[PDB]
Design a protein around this ligand. Structure first.
Ligand SMILES: Nc1ncnc2c1ncn2[C@@H]1O[C@H](COP(=O)(O)OP(=O)(O)OP(=O)(O)O)[C@@H](O)[C@H]1O
Ligand SMILES: CC(C)C[C@H](N)CO
Ligand SMILES: [Mg+2]
Ligand SMILES: [Mg+2]
Ligand SMILES: [Zn+2]
Length: 862
């Protein structure tokens, strides 16, 4: 065994040894239980950084742990190669989108392979190749036939910098998720996935996700934004139906999320476009002056009345500016004693306020809005007839019973969520499989003629959709009539691919469907998913929707894609930038910046070392490829070795917690790896290997007994930490503690060396998921078997039994007590414990003499 710890020697070798054994290349093996552990795959938007190390070392640790426990482990990796992140990274580097993506993919494969991750590279996938995206083209056409995908004009979010429309999930604080520019409103046709159709299931199936962080689940609940309301009809009075036709003559329909207040409505409000507004203004020009005014909070009375269904009150109808014709009903009711928006409006014109809710008994002031009025949680109903005394839940159902039995209403559910707009005016994206024919309409491309192949030799000129200036691409024949027609030039958003790729990993070479039935039946769902919480509202919602879509088609048979979700905390570091002449920002790596400090130690100035000219200091921020603040793992592997990169990131903090970059933390992770190497080498220099201690330990010294206790305690604690707590920093700390006691333990005797062997064989296996290169090498110097067949270390709980004795206690001869003591518990602690529990102190004045038998009995004399 060499004595210097040289990563560049042992690390490539260990990777070659794992690769040759094909340990990470798994198939649908029914003899082993399956474990699908997946980390969120990267965009080719630059170099990987130490945040990615943390992300994927977490995954690798969980996979390697389950592999050592006999599981059949699939840990795949691929590339989110389509869409905006790879294209923008390509144009900022003035490279063709295809050329850049394929080059960055190979650099990221190089970067990841130097880290020794146990990845099944035979399932590698690049979402920009036709053999991938043809299958989402196929799913598009099928859904389009059913109308689950549809095209429609409407108001959309427009990113002026990326020159494309985004989905509502791609707008972050009114700005583009990639550009950061303010989003404008525009009316553009778009292809939508009808995600509102699945709004109820996506909300209710979050209750199934017991191993998801509750933040992700509540954030998706608030994004789906469910509200249970009530459709309510107020009949038009027998003397206001002038000019009204159809249903608009007989009733005024409104919506309300507070149907419990219905007995308190004192007037209604109507839209200028609502038909009762037009017949009321037909002979009243001042009403048409308001109808022309907007079409702030203003309103006019109309003198036409509608009847409350629940008590027969005749309420006056108001033209109001806050009733946007597009409400669904275009009209509301107004309970001003319990809605702030309505109390303000009905103080503007002195309308009445009847109170119908009491909270405990907060006194009711008619012209003084108190916050308890809108309490939908701690209130019971007042002045409401047989609805008196009900709470909000019970009064909801009772109003629905009332309204439905007379037909005047019914519950109606609304969602803040809107359909998913996936069209993009961009080149580097999966082509949309539609052909517009002047005779047949928007027709899908037949399954036999898929994929519609995106040409890869294009460079965007940065001036609109490049495919739309390419008649060689869009001029085609109609699939239905043979006539001339044009291809859809918009492409699919990048979140299409990432919504199903976890299935593609199960059969990436399958050429007849999205995923083959035999492999989807085997791999089931992703057992473990690891990725940042920033995906809560977009990807982690999209992927549940797609999974349900694929299930309803018969491709998969799971309801949810990811059983366990671990959201790792962000590695953060400094970030700098300049402002470019295009109004944007040019981000700069802290390694190209030279700082100037204050007298107190604060950075004051920062200049780029290339030109000495200043740069702006942006402060600590998440390590990001798009903000050019990453620490490259290859620059650490070359200097310190891959294991040090891995050990530092699993040790600095618990996986969920924020981690700040520091050079001290890298040196420390290395000195421990030297300590591990030095420990195994020194043990081997003074004797060589021996058969690890096992079996009964009667006869071992107390000191080595204590060590075996520390040993199997640690194995138990590391096992609990990998596979229940999923806390890796504390698994590493426990092994250090084990090594601390080993350093303090004389292990030179024949039995001591057998215990040293047992400890070291255990330690390197315990740390193999975290630092596999150094452990695999050390294991081979200690033991000739294959590490992954020796398996995960077992806890020998015989070694956990404490070394104790139970001595007799007597008073003047006759036995009256029994006490527990340590093995080497001195006669003073013995005699003190003997004269300190029941039998001796209840039959005792002090003792005249205490004769002690060494480790047998102690007799009190009185
Ligand atoms: N600083 C970081 N710390 C921890 N995890 C990170 C960090 N940056 C990215 N990740 C995670 O790595 C995975 C891949 O992210 P991605 O490919 O978007 O890289 P990125 O650094 O975010 O690049 P970009 O800024 O262009 O999006 C995701 O699970 C993401 O949450
Ligand atoms: C699963 C995907 C949405 C993750 C992206 N490729 C990186 O954030
Ligand atoms: Mg990202
Ligand atoms: Mg369950
Ligand atoms: Zn046609």
């Amino acid at each position: 065994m060499q004595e210097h710890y040289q990563p560049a020697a042992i690390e490539p070798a260990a990777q070659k040894k794992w690769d040759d054994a094909r340990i990470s290349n798994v198939s649908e093996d029914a003899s082993k239980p399956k474990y699908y552990c997946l980390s969120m795959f990267p965009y080719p938007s630059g170099k990987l950084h130490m945040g990615h190390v943390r992300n994927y070392t977490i995954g690798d640790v969980l996979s390697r742990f389950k592999l050592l426990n006999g599981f059949n482990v699939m840990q795949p990796m691929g590339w989110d190669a389509f869409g905006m992140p790879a294209e923008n990274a390509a144009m900022k580097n003035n490279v063709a989108p295809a050329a850049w993506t394929y080059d960055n993919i190979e650099y990221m494969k190089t970067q990841l392979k130097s880290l020794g991750f146990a990845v099944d590279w035979e399932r590698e996938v690049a979402t920009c190749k036709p053999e991938y995206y043809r299958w989402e083209q196929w799913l598009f056409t099928k859904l389009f036939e059913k109308g689950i995908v549809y095209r429609k004009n409407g108001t959309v979010n427009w990113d002026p910098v990326d020159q494309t429309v985004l989905a509502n999930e791609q707008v972050i604080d009114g700005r583009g998720w990639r550009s950061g520019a303010l989003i404008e409103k525009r009316e553009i046709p778009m292809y939508y996935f009808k995600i509102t159709d699945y709004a109820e299931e996506l909300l209710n199936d979050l209750d199934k996700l017991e191993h998801w962080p509750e933040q992700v689940k509540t954030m998706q609940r608030n994004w789906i934004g469910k509200s249970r309301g009530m459709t309510v009809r107020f009949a038009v009075s027998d003397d206001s139906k002038q000019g009204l036709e159809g249903d608009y003559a007989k009733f005024l329909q409104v919506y309300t999320t507070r149907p419990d207040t219905l007995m308190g409505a004192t007037y209604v409000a109507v839209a200028a476009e609502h038909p009762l507004a037009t017949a009321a203004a037909a002979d009243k020009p001042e009403l048409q002056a308001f109808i022309a005014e907007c079409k702030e909070k203003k309103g006019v009375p109309t003198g036409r009345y509608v009847v409350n269904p629940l008590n027969g009150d005749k309420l006056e109808v108001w033209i109001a500016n806050y009733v946007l014709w597009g409400y669904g009903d275009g009209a509301v009711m107004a309970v001003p004693a319990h809605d702030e928006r309505d109390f303000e409006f009905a103080a503007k014109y002195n309308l009445p306020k009847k109170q119908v809710i009491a909270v405990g008994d907060n006194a009711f002031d008619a012209n003084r809005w108190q916050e308890w009025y809108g309490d939908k949680e701690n209130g019971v109903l007042v002045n409401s007839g047989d609805l008196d005394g009900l709470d909000f839940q019970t009064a909801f159902d009772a109003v629905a019973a009332k309204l439905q039995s007379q037909g005047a209403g019914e519950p109606k559910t609304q969602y803040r969520l809107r359909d998913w707009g996936i069209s993009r005016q961009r080149y580097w994206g999966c082509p949309i499989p539609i052909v517009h024919c002047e005779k047949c309409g928007n027709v899908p491309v037949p399954a036999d003629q898929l994929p519609v192949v995106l040409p890869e030799n294009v460079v965007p000129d940065g001036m609109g959709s490049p495919l739309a200036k390419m008649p060689e691409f869009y001029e085609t024949s109609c699939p239905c009539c043979g006539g001339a027609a044009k291809r859809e030039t918009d492409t699919m958003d990048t979140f299409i691919e990432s919504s199903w790729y976890f299935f593609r990993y199960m059969s990436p070479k399958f050429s007849d469907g999205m995923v083959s039935a035999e492999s989807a039946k085997y791999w089931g769902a992703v057992d473990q998913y690891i990725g940042g919480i920033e995906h809560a509202i977009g990807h982690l919602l999209y992927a549940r929707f797609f999974t349900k879509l694929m299930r309803d088609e018969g491709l998969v048979n799971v309801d949810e894609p990811f059983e366990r979700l671990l959201t790792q905390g962000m590695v953060v570091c400094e970030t700098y930038y300049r402002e470019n002449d295009k109004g944007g920002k040019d981000w700069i790596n802290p390694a190209d910046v030279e700082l100037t400090f204050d007298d107190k130690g604060r950075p004051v100035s920062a200049v780029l070392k290339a030109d000495g000219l200043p740069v702006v200091i942006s402060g600590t921020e998440k390590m990001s490829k798009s903000k050019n603040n990453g620490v490259d793992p290859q620059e650490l592997i070359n200097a310190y070795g891959a294991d040090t990169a891995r050990l530092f990131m699993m040790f600095a903090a618990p996986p969920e917690q924020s981690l700040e970059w520091s050079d001290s933390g890298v040196e420390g992770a290395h000195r421990f790896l030297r300590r591990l190497w030095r420990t195994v080498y020194e043990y081997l220099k003074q004797g060589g290997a021996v058969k690890a201690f096992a079996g009964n330990q009667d006869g071992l010294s107390k000191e080595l007994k204590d060590l075996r206790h520390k040993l199997h305690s640690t194995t138990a604690k590391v096992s609990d930490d990998y596979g229940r707590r999923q806390q890796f920093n504390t698994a590493i700390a426990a092994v250090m503690e084990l090594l601390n006691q080993y350093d303090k333990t004389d292990t030179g005797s024949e039995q001591g060396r057998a215990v040293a062997q047992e400890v070291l064989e255990a330690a390197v296996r315990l740390l193999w998921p975290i630092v596999p290169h150094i452990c695999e090498t050390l294991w081979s110097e200690l033991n000739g078997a294959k590490l992954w067949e020796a398996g995960w270390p077992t806890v020998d709980e015989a070694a956990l039994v404490k070394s104790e004795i139970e001595v007799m206690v007597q008073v003047n001869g006759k036995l009256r007590g029994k006490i527990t003591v340590a093995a080497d518990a001195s006669k003073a602690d013995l005699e003190a414990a003997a004269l300190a529990n029941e039998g001796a102190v209840k039959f005792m004045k002090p003792a005249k003499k205490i004769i002690v038998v060494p480790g047998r009995l102690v007799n009190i004399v009185v």
